[PDB]
Amino acid sequence: SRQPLEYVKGVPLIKYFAEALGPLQSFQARPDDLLISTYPKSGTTWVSQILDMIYQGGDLEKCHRAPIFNRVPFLEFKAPGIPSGMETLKDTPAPRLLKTHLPLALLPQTLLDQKVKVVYVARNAKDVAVSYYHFYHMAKVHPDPGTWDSFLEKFMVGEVCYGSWYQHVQEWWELSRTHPVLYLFYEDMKENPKREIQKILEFVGHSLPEETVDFMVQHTSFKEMKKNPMTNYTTIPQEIMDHSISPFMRKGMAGDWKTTFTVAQNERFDADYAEKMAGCSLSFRSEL
Numbered sequence: 129s130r131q132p133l134e135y136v137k138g139v140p141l142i143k144y145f146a147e148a149l150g151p152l153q154s155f156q157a158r159p160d161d162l163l164i165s166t167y168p169k170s171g172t173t174w175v176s177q178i179l180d181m182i183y184q185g186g187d188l189e190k191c192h193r194a195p196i197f198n199r200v201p202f203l204e205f206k207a208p209g210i211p212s213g214m215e216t217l218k219d220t221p222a223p224r225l226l227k228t229h230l231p232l233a234l235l236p237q238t239l240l241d242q243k244v245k246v247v248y249v250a251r252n253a254k255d256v257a258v259s260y261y262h263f264y265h266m267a268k269v270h271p272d273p274g275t276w277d278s279f280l281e282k283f284m285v286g287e288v289c290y291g292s293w294y295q296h297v298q299e300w301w302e303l304s305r306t307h308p309v310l311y312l313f314y315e316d317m318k319e320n321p322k323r324e325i326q327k328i329l330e331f332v333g334h335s336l337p338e339e340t341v342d343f344m345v346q347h348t349s350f351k352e353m354k355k356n357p358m359t360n361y362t363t364i365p366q367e368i369m370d371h372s373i374s375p376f377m378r379k380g381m382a383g384d385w386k387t388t389f390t391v392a393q394n395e396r397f398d399a400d401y402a403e404k405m406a407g408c409s410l411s412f413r414s415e416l
C-alpha cells in the first residue's frame with residue numbers, strides 16, 4: 129500500500145486516480161450539471177452538503193439517502209473495495225452534483241464545452257497544508273507524508289497529490305473571467321455561512337424560505353457535519369480512511385495553523401508565498 133505519486137501532464141496524482149482518468153475520458157457532461165471544484169482540504173465536503181441540501185429542497189431525510197461521497201460522484205476517484213467515481217456517476221440522477229480536485233490541465237473538456245456551472249472553494253494555503261498533512265496519514269492511499277516539516281517542503285513545491293495549491297487557486301480564479309464560476313472562500317463561509325449560502329442559492333437560481341436557510345446553516349455546521357455519519361466519511365472502509373489516526377472532520381477552524389507552523393516555517397512560507405502570488409488579485413485571510 130501507500131504507493132508513490134504518479135505524474136500526468138505535470139500533475140502528481142494518486143496511482144488509482146491516475147488510472148481513473150482512463151474511464152473518466154468517456155464521461156459526458158450535462159448542461160444542467162454543477163461542478164464542485166476545490167484544491168484538497170479547502171471545504172469540498174462542506175459546500176457539498178450545502179448544495180445537496182439545496183438540491184433536496186432543504187429536506188434532511190433525503191440528504192441522508194446515502195453518504196456524501198455517493199450523493200456527489202467524485203470524478204477522478206478510485207480505490208480498492210469501493211465503487212469508482214464514474215461507477216457512482218452512472219446511478220446519479222440529474223440534476224447532478226459533481227466533485228473534483230483536478231487542475232484545468234486534466235479537467236474533462238466536456239465540462240468546459242457544456243458551460244457547466246462551477247462552485248469553486250478556496251482556503252488559505254497554511255490551513256490547507258496542515259489539514260492536508262493529517263489527511264495524508266488517515267487516507268491510506270496517499271504516500272507516507274513523513275515529518276510535518278518535510279511535508280511542508282513538498283507542499284511548497286507542489287510535490288503533493290494534485291500539484292501546486294498556488295497554481296490551482298489562481299488558474300480557477302482566472303477561469304471565472306470567462307466561465308460561470310462561483311468563487312468562494314472557506315474563511316468567508318466560516319465567518320458568515322448564511323451569507324455564503326445565500327450566494328450559492330442565487331448562483332443556482334433556486335429560492336428557499338428564510339426559515340429553511342437557517343435550517344441548512346445549522347446542519348452544514350462543523351458540529352452537525354461531524355456528528356452526521358452521511359458526511360463525516362466514517363462509513364468508508366478503514367483501509368481507505370482510518371479515523372483513529374485522524375478524523376476527516378478534524379478541527380474545522382480557520383487560523384488553527386498557528387499551533388503547527390514554527391516561526392521559522394512561517395517566515396520561509398510568507399516569503400515564498402509573496403513571490404508566487406505576486407501579480408494576483410486574490411486576497412486570502414489566514415485567520416478570522
Ligand SMILES: Nc1ncnc2c1ncn2[C@@H]1O[C@H](COP(=O)(O)O)[C@@H](OP(=O)(O)O)[C@H]1O
Nearest residue numbers: 169170171172173259348349350377378379380
Ligand atoms: N461544516 C464544516 N464547517 C467548517 N469546516 C468543515 C466543515 N466540514 C468539514 N470541514 C473541514 O473542511 C476540511 C476538509 O475539506 P475537504 O471537504 O475539501 O476535504 C477539514 O478541515 P480541517 O482538517 O482544518 O478540520 C474539515 O474538518
Ligand SMILES: O=[N+]([O-])c1ccc(O)cc1
Nearest residue numbers: 168172229267269270368
Ligand atoms: O483518498 N481519498 O479517499 C480521498 C482523497 C481526496 C478526497 O477529496 C477525498 C477522498
